[PDB]
Amino acid sequence: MFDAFTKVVSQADTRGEMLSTAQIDALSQMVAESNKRLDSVNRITSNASTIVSNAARSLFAEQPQLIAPGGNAYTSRRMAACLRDMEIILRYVTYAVFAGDASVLEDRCLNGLRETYLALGTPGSSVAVGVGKMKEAALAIVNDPAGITPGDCSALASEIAGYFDRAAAAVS
Amino acid sequence: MFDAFTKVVSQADTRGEMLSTAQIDALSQMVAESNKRLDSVNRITSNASTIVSNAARSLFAEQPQLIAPGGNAYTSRRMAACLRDMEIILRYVTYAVFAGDASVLEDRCLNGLRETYLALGTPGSSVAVGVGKMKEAALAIVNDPAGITPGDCSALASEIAGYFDRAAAAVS
Amino acid sequence: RQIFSEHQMLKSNRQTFLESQLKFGQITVRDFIGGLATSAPFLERNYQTNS
Amino acid sequence: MKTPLTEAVSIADSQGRFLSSTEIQVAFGRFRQAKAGLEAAKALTSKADSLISGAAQAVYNKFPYTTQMQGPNYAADQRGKDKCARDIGYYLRMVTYCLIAGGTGPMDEYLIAGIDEINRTFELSPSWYIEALKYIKANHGLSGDAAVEANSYLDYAINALS
Amino acid sequence: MKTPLTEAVSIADSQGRFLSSTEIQVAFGRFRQAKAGLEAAKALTSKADSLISGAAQAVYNKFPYTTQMQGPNYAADQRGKDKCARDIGYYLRMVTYCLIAGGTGPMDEYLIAGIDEINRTFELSPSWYIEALKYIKANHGLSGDAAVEANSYLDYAINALS
Amino acid sequence: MKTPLTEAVSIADSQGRFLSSTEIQVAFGRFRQAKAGLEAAKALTSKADSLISGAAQAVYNKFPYTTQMQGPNYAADQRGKDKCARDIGYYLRMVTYCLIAGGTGPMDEYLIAGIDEINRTFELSPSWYIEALKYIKANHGLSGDAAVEANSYLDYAINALS
Ligand SMILES: *[C@H](C)[C@H]1/C(=C/c2[nH]c(/C=C3N=C(/C=C4\NC(=O)C(CC)=C4C)C(C)=C\3CCC(=O)O)c(CCC(=O)O)c2C)NC(=O)[C@@H]1C
Ligand SMILES: *[C@H](C)[C@H]1/C(=C/c2[nH]c(/C=C3N=C(/C=C4\NC(=O)C(CC)=C4C)C(C)=C\3CCC(=O)O)c(CCC(=O)O)c2C)NC(=O)[C@@H]1C
Ligand SMILES: CCC1=C(C)/C(=C/C2=NC(=C\c3[nH]c(/C=C4\NC(=O)[C@H](C)[C@H]4CC)c(C)c3CCC(=O)O)/C(CCC(=O)O)=C2C)NC1=O
Ligand SMILES: CCC1=C(C)/C(=C/C2=NC(=C\c3[nH]c(/C=C4\NC(=O)[C@H](C)[C@H]4CC)c(C)c3CCC(=O)O)/C(CCC(=O)O)=C2C)NC1=O
Ligand SMILES: CCC1=C(C)/C(=C/C2=NC(=C\c3[nH]c(/C=C4\NC(=O)[C@H](C)[C@H]4CC)c(C)c3CCC(=O)O)/C(CCC(=O)O)=C2C)NC1=O
Ligand SMILES: CCC1=C(C)/C(=C/C2=NC(=C\c3[nH]c(/C=C4\NC(=O)[C@H](C)[C@H]4CC)c(C)c3CCC(=O)O)/C(CCC(=O)O)=C2C)NC1=O
Ligand SMILES: CCC1=C(C)/C(=C/C2=NC(=C\c3[nH]c(/C=C4\NC(=O)[C@H](C)[C@H]4CC)c(C)c3CCC(=O)O)/C(CCC(=O)O)=C2C)NC1=O
Questions:
Q1: A46 vs chain E: nearest CA distance in angstroms?
Q2: All residues at 6 or more sequence positions from F126 whose CB lies less than 8 Å from its CB, including other chains
Q3: N or C: which end of chain B has fewer CB within 10 A?
Q4: Radius of gyration in angstroms for the set of CA atoms belonging to chain D, rounded to a whole number
Q5: Residues of chain C with a CB closer than 8 angstroms to some CB in chain E
Q6: How far is CA F92 from CA A69, D53, F20, F50, F137, in A?
Q7: Is A15 annotated as a binding residue?
Q8: How distant, in Å, are the alpha carbons of D72, E37, E150, E156 from that of E143?
Q9: Residue E116: which residues within 8 A CB-CB, separation 6 or more?
Q10: Distance (Å, rounded) from C-alpha E85 to C-alpha E79?
């Protein structure tokens, strides 16, 4: 549970001194691009149900063993729980790119959910591939411009793909 | 919370003597017609969602003030709560005609729900008319012998209409 | 049913994250009751409408 | 898993007591039920494939738009028909499982508990499954008390759907 | 009623503290939002009747079966069309209410909280309302940041539907 | 071939005179018509295949006996359905041709002039085609003045049928 600003504050307190000037110029540029960060969240957030349905749509086209009887996501209840797990992961990705820090995504799902999927018998590979495909579709949905001002989304495509790869690797 | 048998047992214990013979012949006839009671109960139970949807369907056709804005059942949340209240009343009617006693229907709904609808501002008249229409449709659904052997449901139409009128009058 | 009442068991009020934590044994039934009684739908419907 | 013996054990365990004559009444009743219900489940097992195809054809008949419009939720292509008739056979298999188990437990745990959110997420109308279950409960061809309780389970699935 | 000032007061009350600079940041942000949002709500109020009729016609166009089959849930008769376009106007009015209130609170309290069980009980497909909201968010004709947050509220209604 | 420019030339030729301002009034009116009618014809060209299948399914729905009875006039077999939907597409193509031509001439020369004796000889009820044209004029999904004159051409075909 950390912001960008609280991250700089905790680092400056562990140093024990005041915040240096270059960190303040970095935070000024962050305050200039924080709304820019926001547009992806605004346009990432609005298409979330389409994102998770298309992600499960491609995943269960890709691995039909999960839909097959005896598969882990075969049962209707389990399949609803599967879509719930995916939607939760997408929501915490949107939270982490809202606050601009991966510590919320770590705190909320990464530490426990690997052991949860081991204990449940859930294959970590399929949900890892699903989070990867969901992240690819999320950046693909975020990057296109419709009646949108020209802008550079490279460091925020960088950051969003970082958050998605952190989620997919912590899942394993 | 009483059966028919527990009702006779409590009455015989308040008398302090054993059960008289005529009560035992009455209970023998009850044991002969208890399955008969049951057939109506199962064909009443299987169509319950159709019963409550048709009841609300006729009620909100009949009183469009509830659907009108500012009406008591206008809001989507309140309308879902309205259908929930009706389904609960139908379920406890089915319980009371299962056990053959109105004491379960009294115990679970009646003494509190009149004061609840007063305190909520719920019009007791509309829900009374809705329980009456639901009961009329319930006896109408029960009395038709489609793929059922020829028997006599007389007294049980009597009992079911008694339970529905008790519910509608305790609502007021 | 105990914390919300039957009429408040709507799909929109359901705390799916608290249910998964309980089913995984991460939280106790007591902590689940605390999570329900501190939930947004409970505070909006039952706290804000009462003294 | 709401089956009668399981819930009798749950009652006796939550009360903290031994078994009484109540559970034995439950038991002679359950054996009375199973004594026809097992043979009825075998008969449904025999007629299952033709019932599945007839239900799918009745569903395509009442809702002809699903065969026509392009959409991955609709059964216009062939994979929609494979998956579609697969979930028809799923519904029929859950009906037979509840016929064997003697309670609505298997359908409640395998079908009902998430079906609403699944049909919400996938744009599946539940009325399709209601039409299919109505065709099955019309065309299963059983007779007597086994037929009535089979219709009871199918009507329970219908009421759980809508 | 999730509106920003209400939830700021709820945060400060549940923490047990006075208001801080955080709520004042919330406030200058909310006034910045409302400074265009009120005029956008007035513009939607102006274009409302034609938007409602266009959404109803687009819904009849994409789902032509609802105009044809006999059924009280379908808008084949005239009372279905009156009630139907009434709930189109309901959706549009809730969009304008959330535009004025500055949060998703009014639609969450007036529409979303029971819509799933209502569409379950009444055999209404939510995809009809998704098509209507898509037509509204295509044809509302606003521009700029007001248009983006209007599309945000409509997309929120879409995601709450399915 | 009753199209406005052709009939204006026929008027001026039968009168034996040159063109006057009357034909130029006819012309600025015809260009006003075509300025929306060509795009409406393109839109009907886009939606044509789904409209044809929907009209055929509505015709099978309202007249279910034609799918059941054996007879080469009825579409019970598959060749009846191929030929049937072929003449559905014929009717829709003539509607688009009259939309481009700006008059009822193409349908009058390609459809209407012999349709009565053909339906008399072949035991085809014209009410089938009336139902199909009604479904098309309900489900074409156009808007405005293009939609009104499209409905005009379809209603003209209906009145020519029965
Ligand atoms: C529709 C027939 C009528 C109607 C119904 C209505 N009821 C409520 C709210 C409540 N209803 C109850 C009733 C019961 N609760 C029980 O536990 C039992 C027995 C087991 C009964 C009979 C209660 C406690 C409430 C309030 C709490 C809640 O969630 O539901 C409402 C909504 C009122 C609101 O503001 O939410 C409605 C609409 N009202 C009508 O308009 C019809 C006449
Ligand atoms: C009542 C409105 C109509 C009616 C009913 C009726 N039923 C019976 C007898 C039986 N009904 C059943 C039904 C079941 N037994 C089961 O175990 C189940 C599953 C839960 C069902 C559905 C049975 C088995 C009996 C008796 C035993 C048997 O049939 O083998 C009768 C006559 C016999 C009796 O009193 O029980 C009647 C009249 N008949 C009508 O005409 C009404 C319209
Ligand atoms: C807030 C963070 C959080 C996470 C991440 C979380 C995960 C989580 N996923 C679970 C189940 C599940 N998760 C999945 C998901 C999948 N399985 C598959 O087959 C696919 C590989 C994948 C779909 C992407 C499935 C199918 C279950 C059901 C297991 C079961 O019910 O038996 C459970 C067991 C309890 C239950 O769902 O109802 C937990 C606790 N819970 C949380 O509270
Ligand atoms: C919450 C409601 C809300 C929204 C939606 C919002 C968006 C928003 N995006 C902006 C800018 C911008 N937004 C973008 C976004 C992009 N350009 C591209 O070419 C990329 C593909 C894409 C990112 C993926 C860009 C490039 C700018 C330029 C100005 C800036 O840096 O802010 C600005 C600057 C001020 C203005 O435009 O008037 C606004 C208002 N502001 C709000 O208050
Ligand atoms: C054992 C109990 C059980 C049930 C009931 C069940 C239903 C079920 N049906 C599904 C899809 C589907 N369901 C249908 C069914 C139909 N669509 C139509 O047009 C027809 C009217 C109807 C044919 C019966 C179709 C075509 C799909 C594939 C659509 C999809 O991508 O999601 C899915 C999503 C999985 C997937 O996408 O492949 C589930 C979980 N699963 C279960 O495990
Ligand atoms: C303010 C927020 C709000 C919403 C959204 C709302 C929806 C709503 N729509 C209803 C019915 C309906 N909803 C529709 C709508 C349609 N059916 C179609 O075929 C069309 C595709 C679509 C036209 C938009 C129709 C025709 C009815 C009447 C059917 C009925 O008896 O239940 C009902 C049941 C009340 C009744 O039966 O009259 C509710 C509560 N109510 C509300 O208070
Ligand atoms: C371009 C304008 C044009 C039209 C309209 C047209 C109609 C037309 N339809 C015909 C037959 C037919 N018309 C139908 C149509 C139907 N029967 C049904 O049961 C359905 C309700 C309906 C489907 C739309 C069928 C099935 C035949 C083949 C029956 C036959 O042997 O004569 C025939 C006789 C040719 C033949 O026997 O194959 C003509 C000329 N031809 C044209 O050139």
A1: 6
A2: F115, F119, F161, F162
A3: N
A4: 18
A5: 10-13, 43-44, 48
A6: 47, 35, 36, 11, 10
A7: no
A8: 34, 12, 10, 19
A9: C10, C11, C12, D116, D120
A10: 10
Rounded to a whole number of angstroms, the distance from the CA of B141 to the nearest CA of chain C is: 27
* H/E run at residue E42: helix E21-46
Which chain E residue lies closest to B80 (C-alpha atoms)? Answer: E114
Please name the residue that has the structure tokens 């998430």: D114
Q: What is the number of other CB atoms lying within 10 angstroms of the CB of residue B55?
A: 25
Residue A4: exposure state from Cβ atoms within 10 A (0-12, 13-18, ≥19): middle
Counting CB pairs under 8 A, whether chains C and F reach 3 or more, is: no
Ligand 3 atom 31, closest CA: A78
Q: Which residues contact D118 (CB under 8 A, 6 or more apart)?
A: A76, A79, A80, A83, D124
With H, G, I as helix, E, B as strand and everything else as coil, classify residue B17: coil
**Which of A97, A119, A99 has its CA nearest to residue A166?**
A97
| D65, D120, D125 ranked by CB distance to E116: nearest | D120
Mutate to test the interface with C, among E7, E110, E117 (most CBs of C within 10 A): E117
CA distance E60 to A141: 29
Q: Which residues contact A35 (CB under 8 A, 6 or more apart)?
A: none
Neighbours of chain B (3+ CB pairs under 8 A): C, D, E
Distance CA E132, CA E122 (A): 18
Atom of ligand 3 lying closest to residue A77 CA: 31
Measured from the alpha carbon of residue F118, the closest ligand is: 7
CA of B34 to the centre of ligand 2 (A): 10
Alpha-carbon D96 to chain mean position:
7
Distance CA B110, CA B115 (A): 9
Residue D31 · residue D131 · CB < 8 Å: no
Nearest chain B residue to E116 by CA distance is B80
Token digits of residue A62: 């890709």
Cβ-nearest to D123 among E116, E123, E162: E162
> Touch between chain C and chain A (3+ CB pairs, < 8 Å)?
yes
D28 lines ligand 5 (CB under 6 A): no
Answer yes or no: do E123 and D65 touch at CB < 8 A: no
Q: Could you count the other beta carbons within 10 Å of the beta carbon of residue E73? A: 16
Question: How far is Cα D119 from Cα D113, in angstroms, rounded to an integer?
Answer: 12
Q: What experiment produced this structure?
A: cryo-EM
**Both tokens assigned to B98:** 């299962």
Decide if D103 contacts D2 (C-beta within 8 A).
Answer: yes
How many helices (H) and strands (E) chain F has is answered by: 9, 0
| Residue C14, token pair as written in the block | 């359901």
Resolution of this entry, Å: 3.5
Sign of CA dihedral F109, F115, F116, F120: positive
Spatial contact of B98 and B159, defined as CB atoms under 8 Å apart: no
Spatial separation of the C-alpha atoms in residues D126 and D128, rounded to whole Å: 5
- Return the closest-CA partner of residue B159 out of B111, B117, B96: B96
Contact B163, B105 (CB under 8 A): yes
Residue F27 CB coordination number (10 Å): 14
> Nearest C-alpha to atom 6 of ligand 1 is from which residue?
B82
Please name the residues in contact with D156: beta carbons below 8 A apart, sequence gap of 6 or more.
B46, D104, D107
The number of the ligand 4 atom at minimal distance from the alpha carbon of E149 is: 2
State the distance between the two ends of chain A, measured CA to CA, in whole angstroms: 23
Q: Residues F73, F79: contact at Cβ < 8 Å?
A: no
What distance in Å separates the CA atoms of residue B157 and residue B140, rounded to the nearest whole number?
9
Quickly count: other Cβ atoms within 10 Å of residue B96's Cβ: 25
Rounded to the nearest 10 degrees, the angle between the axes of helix E126-139 and helix E145-161 is: 170
Output the residue whose Cα is nearest ligand 7's atom 36. F83
